[PDB]
């Protein structure tokens, strides 16, 4: 959670019955030089949820998940095709 690293502790994961930022259902701790870590162990029954977001986020990334620890592996320099 730090300032412009990431565009997660700004999104939201929807809960049971309301919304939440991710930096609120989860911490978020910049493991690797490439790699958010969210500790779920605040709401490990909204873990799958937290996931949900990110790929519920405009964001064809693939979160992980270890038991309460959400992984979150940054993309390389340029996506894909680009050139317009």
């Known amino acids: 959670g730090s300032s412009g690293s990431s565009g997660l502790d700004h ?4 809960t049971a ?3 939440v930022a ?3 259902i989860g911490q978020i701790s910049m493991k690797s030089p490439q ?3 969210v500790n779920m162990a605040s709401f490990p029954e ?5 996931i ?13 998940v270890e038991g309460t620890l959400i992984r979150v592996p940054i993309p390389k320099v ?7």
């Open 11 to 14: 999104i939201t994961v929807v």
């Open 17 to 19: 019955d309301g919304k």
């Open 22 to 24: 991710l930096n609120q």
């Open 35 to 37: 790699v958010i870590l």
């Open 46 to 50: 909204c873990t799958a949820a937290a």
């Open 52 to 64: 949900k977001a990110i790929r519920e986020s405009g964001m064809n990334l693939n979160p992980e």
């Open 78 to 84: 340029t996506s894909g095709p680009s050139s317009g």
